[PDB]
């Protein structure tokens, strides 16, 4: 069955030259060989000259000098650069500058793609660095005329206010945190400028409210706030508008500042429009005039950004291509189930979150990621690193059968001298892998494909697909975002994507939100300009396109765990957020907050281009192509190391050449390969190409990503201009087909939650008790603590067993601070006496962190702490009686009786008990044979009358009399729990108290508790006859 459906359109990419210009230049279509001539015959090409001008001006000047016949200094670096750019313009589809272009097609019944006469329109727009330089200058000089607003990434921690990063730089290093003292005037400003305020309106209000008496004090205060970007002006353009330059012009006109600049900007706008009308190759003179004019306003390294559009005549493809992608995705998602732990760092972070905050709380995003007041970021995050000494070892737990399956394939391929590895559906089905759930399939994806017609002998749509080097993306619309200004109507595309995303999720609880942020290196933001159709927006360090009604803030997001998967929520909206980022920004370079928000949008979803074999074959220096029907998922790859290529940094050419031919003959490297960073396609039977390769190899440590890939050397291309072939790449966006108490307001350091030592609670941890726990609890703790309770020095106590690396006992005493400090001298004597007998080693006094939300809130936990007290008394009595020999029941029988007694007294009716115990899966089959003692269990676990089946003997009578001390308090607690209306699913509390009781009686043992629950469920199920 098909999992994915196509959208309304796709993208086409094609370089500016045909592949004929590549073979003609490397003396393939002509046998003549010569360094110059061809170099002069290309450097005088108009299209080549302009394409170089738009990208590298220095090389353009050097080309002009060379054409003038002047003395070129190097002439080696010159030749290498010219060769690399010519190869890129002929053979690399990826769009950049005037080297390559983009267009948008449609699906149909037949494939026809053709070129029009008027190709290659230009789309020139000012760079972001230029605009930001102008904006900063304006707001530095004319701040008095501007309107300012508060930054959305601000975080107030105690008496300091912080930002996640800074757009500026410290000397020559980035700024990872700026903190200022959050004084009273700062808070007043933080309230006034919440949604925008004029400079004078704020300044005079502050002067009125403080009287300062020195105006230069307020001016410096506000200027210091503005310089550090705590206040954002209205001149700064959004990244999610369709035109940043027009927005800036309108804003400066509104402010009425720097009149000379306003007319100059309009002149630049007018000139910039003319350049967009010239054909490619004819705009050299206009570009220079425009560049000279623009550089006079603000001189920066990057001034103009240029893109071009193919403008094809026909752009249809056969809709059969969507079936093949579905087959590929079926097999790729089937294999994904062989890896058990695909995200180890996030899986560890979930455990840290659960250990710290439990599962019934929602924690602020910025507090959670803080090193001091949180748990820090995951252990692989590079922006502020976790300063804790945790273990970073990780293991993805690949299945052994699949690992063996992929090694036989490699061995067979080597033995038979085959160049490819073919995987098949029937072979994968024999591995008996687990099935994937509809909840783990990603909602949308994109895939990059190079399509080549299999053969011209039949004139038929037999297509051969090669997955592109980048493999696509994890969401539909990420690749299309950058080109929003070139689409005919971009809104309809993103509106459809948003509608489909909403269709796939439960409504009335979710909203869509777009994350936009302006990095420190504003050069990286040129790819972040894009449109979106999400309902809300969060813009950091820039203005937003939305009204203040649809504005989100970083200090408003709250994180939680539901079904063991993270989610984000907005406190003000009370809606969960469905976060989107419609651009190819690399998360790993972003701050921790942005990177974390990106991660949890893919939480528990399989990543389709994380291949299983990548870990099996990582140690090999040769890997054959991996194929599936008519897909080449991976190309054939060779890589060089110090063993097979002994190259020194001082190695001379003509010795590398002779050493490299041995490599070619030994490993069978074909004639055409890709050098897979930036130099790409290379013809190895050409001296200049090997010169390129030695220059690249020597610099790149001789191992640093020197990976050769085979060329797509079968089939023919599908895009033709008259009779010239063009290399074409498709980007196919797909969407999934649809198949049918946390509101607590207690802060983390509230006096209700954390109790300091002797703050009404004395919390003691006893170490070194492993071998004598039962005797200690039964005889020593019991007597001393009960004597304290009777004397009225403490009101109650309870204990439990835990493990922080080492095993210990946690004992908590409740009384006033004065009494707790009064009896401590006697507690020391007691513990010294206990130690002298070898029953313990040492102890500590710790802070008590109460689990308010886990036990029903602030009003009900005070009763859970009495339930714990009576349960501790009962545990002591049972252990003492068991050691004295009063009864001889096994551990399992005691556990079962205790669980049944808890459920019966809490008020859970029999109709629910078997469902309740089965809810943890334990009751399925696991201990059906172990219940071979059916009769004894059925007699003991029946609670009819007054446990009549248990009171038949003195042992059972004693056991049931010990337990009844615990009944009235549990009944009271259950009544109060079910009386509350804010508390839902009281079955969560019952499970917690049962877990605690089992821990007290038997310690840390998961398997034993599972067994006890399973046996209890089976025993209760068999008694269905007696109700």
């Amino acid at each position: 069955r098909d999992l994915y459906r196509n959208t309304n359109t796709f993208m086409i990419r094609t370089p500016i030259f045909s592949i004929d210009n590549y073979y003609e230049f490397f003396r393939k279509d002509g046998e003549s060989d010569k360094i110059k001539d061809r170099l002069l015959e290309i450097c005088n090409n108009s299209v080549f000259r302009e394409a170089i001008l738009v990208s590298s001006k220095s090389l353009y000047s050097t080309i002009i000098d060379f054409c003038d016949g002047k003395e070129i200094k190097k002439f080696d670096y010159f030749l290498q650069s010219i060769y690399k750019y010519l190869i890129r313009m002929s053979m690399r589809p990826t769009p950049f500058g005037l080297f390559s272009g983009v267009d948008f097609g449609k699906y149909a019944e037949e494939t026809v793609i053709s070129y029009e006469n008027d190709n290659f329109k230009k789309f020139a727009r000012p760079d972001l660095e230029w605009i930001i330089k102008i904006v900063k200058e304006l707001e530095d000089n004319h701040y008095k005329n501007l309107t300012f607003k508060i930054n959305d990434s601000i975080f107030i921690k105690g008496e300091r206010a912080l930002l996640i990063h800074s757009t500026d730089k410290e000397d020559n290093n980035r700024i990872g945190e700026i903190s200022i003292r959050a004084t009273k005037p700062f808070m007043r400003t933080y309230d006034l400028a919440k949604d925008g305020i004029e400079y004078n309106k704020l300044k005079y209000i502050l002067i009125d409210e403080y009287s300062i008496e020195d105006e230069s004090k307020i001016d410096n205060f506000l200027k210091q706030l503005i310089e550090r970007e705590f206040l954002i002006s209205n001149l700064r353009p959004p990244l999610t508008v369709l035109d940043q330059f027009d927005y800036l012009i309108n804003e400066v006109k509104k402010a009425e500042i720097e009149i000379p600049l306003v007319d100059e900007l309009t002149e630049i706008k007018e000139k910039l429009k003319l350049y967009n009308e010239t054909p490619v190759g004819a705009g050299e003179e206009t570009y220079l005039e425009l560049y000279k004019k623009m550089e006079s306003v603000a001189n920066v390294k990057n001034i103009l950004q240029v893109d071009m559009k193919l403008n094809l005549r026909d752009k249809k493809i056969n809709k059969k291509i969507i079936s093949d992608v579905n087959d590929l995705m079926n097999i790729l998602l089937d294999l994904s189930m062989s890896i058990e732990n695909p995200e180890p760092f996030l899986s560890k972070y979930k455990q840290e979150f659960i250990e710290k905050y439990g599962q019934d709380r929602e924690i602020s995003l910025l507090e959670m990621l803080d090193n001091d007041i949180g748990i820090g970021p995951p252990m692989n995050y590079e922006r502020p690193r976790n300063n804790r000494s945790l273990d970073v070892s990780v293991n993805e737990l690949l299945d052994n059968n699949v690992r063996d399956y992929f090694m036989e394939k490699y061995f067979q391929a080597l033995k038979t001298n085959s160049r490819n590895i073919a995987i098949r559906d029937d072979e994968i089905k024999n591995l008996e892998l687990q099935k994937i759930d509809y909840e783990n399939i990603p909602d949308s994806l994109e895939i990059n494909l190079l399509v080549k017609n299999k053969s011209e002998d039949n004139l038929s749509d037999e297509f051969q697909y090669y997955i592109g080097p980048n493999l696509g993306s994890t969401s539909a619309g990420k690749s299309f975002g950058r080109f929003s200004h070139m689409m005919s109507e971009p809104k309809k595309f993103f509106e459809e994507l948003d509608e489909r995303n909403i269709e796939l999720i439960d409504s009335e609880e979710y909203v869509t939100c777009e994350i936009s942020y302006l990095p420190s290196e504003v050069r990286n933001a040129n790819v972040t300009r894009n449109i979106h159709s999400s309902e809300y927006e969060m813009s950091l360090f820039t203005n937003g396109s939305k009204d203040n009604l649809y504005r989100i803030k970083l200090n408003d997001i709250y994180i939680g765990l539901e079904n063991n998967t993270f989610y984000a929520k907005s406190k003000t909206l009370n809606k969960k957020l469905l976060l989107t980022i419609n651009n190819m920004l690399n998360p790993q370079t972003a701050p921790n907050a942005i990177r974390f928000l990106n991660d949890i949008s893919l939480d528990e979803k399989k990543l389709w281009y994380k291949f299983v074999w990548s870990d099996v074959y990582k140690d090999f220096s040769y890997i054959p192509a991996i194929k599936y029907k008519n897909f080449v998922i991976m190309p054939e790859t060779w890589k060089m190391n110090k063993i097979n290529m002994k190259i020194n940094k001082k190695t001379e050419f003509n010795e590398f050449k002779n050493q490299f031919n041995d490599y070619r003959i030994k490993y069978g490297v074909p004639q055409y390969v890709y050098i897979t960073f930036a130099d790409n396609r290379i013809l190895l039977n050409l001296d200049d190409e090997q010169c390129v390769k030695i220059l690249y190899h020597e610099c790149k440590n001789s191992f640093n990503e020197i990976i050769l890939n085979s060329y797509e050397e079968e089939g023919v291309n599908i895009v033709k201009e008259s009779h010239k072939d063009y290399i074409c790449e498709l980007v196919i966006p797909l969407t999934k087909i649809k198949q049918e108490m946390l509101s607590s307001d207690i802060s983390s350091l509230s006096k209700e939650r954390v109790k300091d030592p002797f703050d009404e609670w004395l919390y003691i941890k006893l170490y070194g008790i492993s071998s004598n726990v039962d005797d200690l609890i039964a005889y020593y703790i019991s007597e001393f603590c009960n004597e304290l309770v009777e004397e009225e020095i403490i009101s109650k106590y309870f204990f439990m067993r835990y493990v922080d690396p080492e095993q210990h006992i946690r004992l908590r005493l409740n009384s006033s601070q004065e009494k707790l400090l009064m009896i401590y001298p006697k507690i020391r004597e007691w513990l010294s006496m206990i130690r002298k007998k070898g029953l313990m080693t040492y102890f500590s006094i710790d802070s008590y962190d109460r689990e308010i939300e886990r036990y029903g809130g602030i009003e009900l936990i005070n009763i859970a702490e009495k339930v714990f007290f009576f349960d501790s008394i009962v545990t002591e009595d049972i252990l003492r009686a068991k050691r004295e020999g009063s009864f001889d029941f096994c551990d399992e029988i005691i556990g079962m009786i205790s669980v049944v007694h808890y459920m019966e007294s809490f008020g859970l009716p029999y109709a629910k008990q078997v469902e309740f115990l089965r809810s943890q899966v334990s009751s399925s089959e696991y201990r059906e044979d172990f219940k071979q003692k059916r009769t004894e269990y059925m007699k003991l676990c029946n609670s009819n009358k007054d446990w009549e089946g248990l009171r038949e003997s003195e042992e059972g009578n004693i056991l049931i009399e010990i337990l009844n001390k615990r009944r009235k308090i549990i009944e009271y607690y259950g009544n109060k729990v079910r009386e509350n209306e804010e508390v839902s699913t009281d079955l969560s509390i019952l499970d917690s108290i049962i877990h605690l009781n089992c821990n007290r009686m038997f310690g840390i043992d998961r398997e034993f508790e599972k067994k006890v629950r399973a046996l209890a469920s089976h025993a209760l199920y068999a008694l269905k006859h007696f109700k």
């Binding site: 300091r160 290093n173 700024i175 945190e177 200022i180 004084t183 005037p185 300062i212 205060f221 550090r228």
Partner: peptide
């Protein structure tokens, strides 16, 4: 310190 003093602290 006065209310208008912002003790700027920067990490780099």
């Amino acid at each position: 310190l006065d209310d208008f003093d912002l003790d700027v602290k920067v990490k780099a």
